[PDB]
Design a binder for this molecule. Structure first.
Ligand SMILES: Nc1nc2c(ncn2[C@@H]2O[C@H](COP(=O)(O)OP(=O)(O)NP(=O)(O)O)[C@@H](O)[C@H]2O)c(=O)[nH]1
Ligand SMILES: COc1ccc2c(C=O)c(O)ccc2c1
Ligand SMILES: [Mg+2]
Lengths: 307, 163
């Protein structure tokens, strides 16, 4: 047979037989996984290399996208096709409504969503007040290290080594060192709290509940540029079920965050930029990116979904 | 944090996947999905140290040489329910010694499904008997279902690797 690895964000993978070789669809691949329908509905196959991530649709044939990757890179980006070999990943469906995600009870679905959420957090893609980030850190301590112990954890435990697995990388230096006391405190509080279930999926679900309020939660990220004496600022464009978010690409600083119904978009005729008009404001800005068309299609779709 | 490449081996149906998924995910896999090849990652604490386990979950009915070359520790899983699964383990052990070209390979014999005490074909004593024949090997009776001796399998391999 032919087979492929479907990765997850934590670096794990599952091999899946390709019944129909490179003609196998996402649909057939999703079936080849060990997920029920109480799992499969939340997730789909993505194709990603270091500088381009795409969600594929059920009818897509992923191995054909792997094949055609240099043309896809050239169409959608300005990158160096030599450095990117894509792989396939199982990830959250960008279309998944938050309301639906809140329904989820399945332990496997929870940990998959959790792993992906954790990945985004540690990479700096989630912008949130220090309080929220500290909570999230305490939950990962519980999740990864188990119950707090005065002996093991009280002092000289959270060095940069340990801190790195629980706080956004963008904060590891400037803010995180100051946090270590308050993380331990909330960690301890979690451990001794008998009102907080220590069941893995319960703790993971809590982590997620904290992520659900972050504006970029579950965002697909595209890249482009804005111009501010005109200075180029490379950006991540984050589109999720909530709206649109710009991150400074270098710092992952949150530049703007707009909810659907509070902004309008216009695709450049050239298909290489889009304009955002931020109503309840005199604010507008233009993003240059060869992903402009995907971005706008996705905006329309996720806006279209709200009722 | 040191990385530990662990490999779970044994014949079809023994519970290689069930043990792995229980250990990593805390879930018990009910359905029987013959594995092609899965890899899992899990951070754990063995002897006061943080370890990153990469656990390869292999096909029973099946690149074997590659796994053995690459792996640092091997869980050799049989089902106490099925005699041939026990019988098959001699060859795997000897193959690993061949490929690694050494007697000193971190390794554990694991008798799985110790919750089906009823349907038990293979005895605990034959289990322990096999392990001593194997240079005073480690031995565990396990249940993916009941969560008995699940973690110990993996921790034991870390310890052995660290020795
Ligand atoms: N009662 C009980 N059933 C178990 C246990 N471990 C596995 N099973 C059951 O045995 C069946 C096969 O287990 P599985 O993990 O798929 O075996 P495997 O060794 O991974 N098989 P393969 O080699 O094909 O990949 C499943 O129905 C599973 O639930 C156990 O400890 N107790
Ligand atoms: C994350 O990448 C993408 C790229 C394009 C789309 C798309 C448009 O075709 C769509 O309808 C839904 C999700 C998408 C995700
Ligand atoms: Mg298996």
């Amino acid at each position: 047979y032919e087979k492929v690895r479907i990765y997850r964000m934590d670096g794990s993978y599952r091999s899946v037989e390709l019944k129909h070789g490179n003609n196998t669809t996402v649909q057939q691949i999703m079936e080849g996984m060990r997920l029920s329908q109480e799992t499969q509905q939340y997730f789909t196959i993505w194709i990603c290399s270091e500088n381009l991530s795409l969600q594929l649709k059920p009818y897509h044939k992923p191995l054909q996208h792997v094949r055609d990757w240099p043309e896809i890179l050239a169409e959608l980006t300005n990158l160096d096709p030599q450095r990117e070999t894509p792989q396939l990943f199982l990830r959250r469906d960008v279309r998944l409504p938050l309301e639906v995600e809140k329904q989820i009870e399945d332990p496997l679905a929870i940990l998959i969503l959790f792993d992906e959420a954790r990945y985004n957090l540690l990479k700096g893609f989630y912008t949130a007040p220090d309080a929220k980030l500290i909570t999230l850190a305490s939950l990962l301590l519980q999740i990864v290290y188990g119950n707090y112990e005065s002996k093991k954890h009280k002092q000289g435990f959270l060095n940069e080594e340990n801190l790195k697995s629980i706080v956004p990388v963008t904060k590891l230096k400037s803010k995180a060192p100051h946090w270590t006391n308050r993380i331990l405190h909330e960690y301890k509080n979690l451990s001794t709290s008998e009102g907080v279930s220590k069941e893995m999926h319960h703790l993971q679900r809590m982590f997620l509940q904290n992520c659900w309020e972050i504006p970029t939660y579950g965002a697909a990220f595209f890249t482009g540029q804005i111009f501010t004496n005109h200075k180029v600022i490379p950006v991540y464009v984050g589109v999720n079920i909530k709206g649109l978010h710009l991150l400074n690409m270098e710092t992952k600083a949150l530049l703007i965050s707009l909810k659907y119904g509070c902004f309008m978009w216009q695709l450049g005729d050239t298909d290489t930029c889009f304009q955002i008009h931020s109503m309840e404001n005199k604010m507008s800005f233009i993003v240059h990116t060869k992903q402009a068309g995907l971005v706008v299609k996705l905006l329309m779709k996720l806006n279209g979904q709200l009722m | 944090m040191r990385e530990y490449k662990l490999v779970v081996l044994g014949s079809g149906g023994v519970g290689k996947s069930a043990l792995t998924v229980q250990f990593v995910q805390g879930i018990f896999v009910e359905k029987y999905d013959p594995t092609i090849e899965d890899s899992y990652r899990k951070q754990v604490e063995v002897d006061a140290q943080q370890c990153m386990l990469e656990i390869l979950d292999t096909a029973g009915t099946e690149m074997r040489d590659l796994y053995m070359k690459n792996g640092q520790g091997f869980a050799l899983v049989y089902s106490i329910t099925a005699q041939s699964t026990f019988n098959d383990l001699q060859d795997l052990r000897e193959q690993i010694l061949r490929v690694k070209d050494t007697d000193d390979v971190p390794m554990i014999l694991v008798g799985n499904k110790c919750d089906l005490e009823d349907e038990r074909v293979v005895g605990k004593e034959q289990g322990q008997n096999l392990a001593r024949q194997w240079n005073n090997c480690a031995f565990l009776e396990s249940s993916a279902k009941s969560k008995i001796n699940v973690n110990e399998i993996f921790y034991d391999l870390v310890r052995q690797i660290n020795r």
